[PDB]
Design a protein around this ligand. Structure first.
Ligand SMILES: [Ir+4]
Ligand SMILES: [Zn+2]
Length: 256
């Protein structure tokens, strides 16, 4: 029964998920002065040309755009990663106001939203096995700022009316996630966790330095979603972000 409210939000999660207080929790604040350039990293290989989107789901916490991950169709490689990670879904976190919403912060700055493209390590065969491994997942995180509209987002915005409430899904085929990327693939990377329960410490985080711009109208449509199910009291789906967690014994590396 976890969520983002006063009674079930991030300050409560540790009671059911004690790893909430673990050594490699996400998100974190990225201190851009302390992050060290790691000339040994590599360029990110983002290979989304064959991506096959299937469906969009309101899961009561966010909405997920789901992909066919039954073969190596959309994969992330290179950078800090060893081997091949397959795209399974993307989702966002966003705020009630444009001054909050991101999970990661940059020198304590909060962005209006954050996109997470979730990928699993094919050496573990399936997502459920991958999340049990310290190198099981690679999540590409992209900040969103409010300014100009992001044309590649509007097809997502267009369908939200059809998945207003928890448990609703819609067909979402032929969506190209390349239209969500910024121009630069410069990034920060560190070892962390899922940012929602079960908070498993299985993620290599790759956070792009360049935000994408979306319009005020695009984000306002995110904020019309509901956390609740159909015919239940309306609770707007806003402020679905976990705040920054202790960095502990970790180093954030810069690709640039
Ligand atoms: Ir309850
Ligand atoms: Zn996320």
């Amino acid at each position: 029964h976890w969520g983002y409210g006063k009674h079930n939000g991030p300050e409560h999660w540790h009671k059911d998920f004690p790893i909430a207080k673990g050594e490699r929790q996400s998100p974190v604040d990225i201190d851009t002065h302390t992050a060290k350039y790691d000339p040994s990293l590599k360029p990110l290989s983002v290979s989304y040309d064959q991506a096959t989107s299937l469906r969009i789901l309101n899961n009561g916490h966010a909405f997920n755009v789901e992909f066919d991950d039954s073969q190596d169709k959309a994969v992330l490689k290179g950078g800090p990663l060893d081997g091949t990670y397959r795209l399974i879904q993307f989702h966002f976190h966003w705020g009630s106001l444009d001054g909050q919403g991101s999970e990661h912060t940059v020198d304590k700055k909060k962005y209006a939203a954050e996109l997470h493209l979730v990928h699993w390590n094919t050496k573990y065969g399936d997502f459920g096995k991958a999340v049990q491994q310290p190198d099981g997942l690679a999540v590409l995180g992209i900040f969103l700022k409010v300014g100009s509209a992001k044309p590649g987002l509007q097809k997502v915005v267009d369908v939200l009316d059809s998945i207003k409430t928890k448990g609703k899904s819609a067909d979402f085929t032929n969506f190209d996630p390349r239209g969500l990327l910024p121009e630069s693939l410069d990034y920060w990377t560190y070892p962390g966790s899922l940012t929602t329960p079960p908070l498993l410490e299985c993620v290599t985080w790759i956070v792009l330095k360049e935000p994408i711009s979306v319009s005020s109208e695009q984000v306002l449509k995110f904020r019309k979603l509901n956390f609740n199910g159909e015919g239940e009291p309306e609770e707007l789906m806003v402020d679905n972000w976990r705040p920054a967690q202790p960095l502990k014994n970790r180093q954030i590396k810069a690709s640039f």
